[PDB]
Amino acid sequence: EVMLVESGGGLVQPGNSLRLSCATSGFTFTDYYMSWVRQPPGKALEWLGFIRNKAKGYTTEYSASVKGRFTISRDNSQSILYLQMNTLRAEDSATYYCARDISPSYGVYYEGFAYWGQGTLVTVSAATTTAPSVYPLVPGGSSVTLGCLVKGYFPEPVTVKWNYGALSSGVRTVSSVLQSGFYSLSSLVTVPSSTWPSQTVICNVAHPASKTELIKRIEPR
Amino acid sequence: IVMTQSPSSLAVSAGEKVTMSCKSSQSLLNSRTRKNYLAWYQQKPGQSPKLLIYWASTRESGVPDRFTGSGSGTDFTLTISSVQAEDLAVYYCKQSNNLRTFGGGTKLEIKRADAAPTVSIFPPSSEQLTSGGASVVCFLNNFYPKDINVKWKIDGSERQNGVLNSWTDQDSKDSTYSMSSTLTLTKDEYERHNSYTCEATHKTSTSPIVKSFNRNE
């Protein structure tokens, strides 16, 4: 099972530097070029650069936009990829992906990124890392709609789950909105009225940047 | 190398055919390998990009017949024989002949039958009030098309300040939208009034859908 996992993301101050890592497993690391790809919120994918496999001498190439600013390296003993980011600006606020690139020297070779990490959001702002508050949404027939209103968190993102991911059906999560330097989103789930409150309904709001999880049990008025 | 995609976005109904363009400033034909180094990726909302076509026309393990990649040189195309609910995504082309360059993307949306929203209203929570905050939330669920309007009325009077609006991505199963409208007051503004009304206006009707509650309940 091929795995690509990004880390190091979060809030970083303008002018500063950040190092990202990309743990891997499930394939012969040194057989593959590895690439980094970034994506500003609501924008297109942008290739940043790659590092080549062993056979090619692990040489690096970068895109015009990031030359002299971003740097790629690899720990071949631990199968970890790295992205060194210097002198960050707001324009660098994006989700950063690591992707397995080609292996032209051994085994199957084709031109494509077969596997990607889940990506890590980097946001460059002088502001303050503040975990969100999670408020319940409950009514004042056969179905009932509930949810959690998530306000005052920074930076992005937050993810919301229900019943620790067991309740996946009828979930709607609106996009975030930014106001007065803070984010908020609300997530709702519709269930059969025979399910609640007779049974338990909980949302799990996760805010990576503060390494925080809030659980909120949805109770009747 | 410069990659240019087209159209930036389009909407078709389930079952319809679609064509997306991708153009590069230089040929992507590699004379040594004799293959075109262009790939198509699919990125669904909140998800990582996934490979569909590589070498211009070769479909990746798992991808259905419905997707076909054509073209050679500097002019390429992604075709979806018949679009389905799963296809909601931005589609990116990527040259890999000289390093790698992504196109700007094509967002694929689905046209579908108009549907009216189910509208709910939510009074503030005690724990938020406890902290001196009062968020009232009107939820509009599973409607189409996307444009929709909510008017807030407090004690019969229209309120416009302190209102935030947010949509979901088009749903991957029924292709609908939902949106929340939130009015945010201080615990003190809120306890100064009783009737809280949100009216939802949509093309599915002349008459707005109205949901209300009284703070004194």
Ligand SMILES: C/C=C\O[C@]1(C(=O)O)C[C@@H](O)[C@@H](O)[C@@H]([C@@H](CO[C@]2(C(=O)O)C[C@@H](O)[C@@H](O)[C@@H]([C@H](O)CO)O2)OC)O1
């Ligand atoms: C001709 C240039 C390189 O040839 C060699 C090399 O000299 O190292 C040897 C060849 O047999 C072959 O292995 C090629 C590689 C080159 O791959 C890249 C690259 O590493 O720069 C990336 C690849 O995605 C593509 O961009 C090619 C490009 O189409 C031609 O250089 O370059 O074959 C994969 O390397």
Ligand SMILES: [Mg+2]
């Ligand atoms: Mg070199």
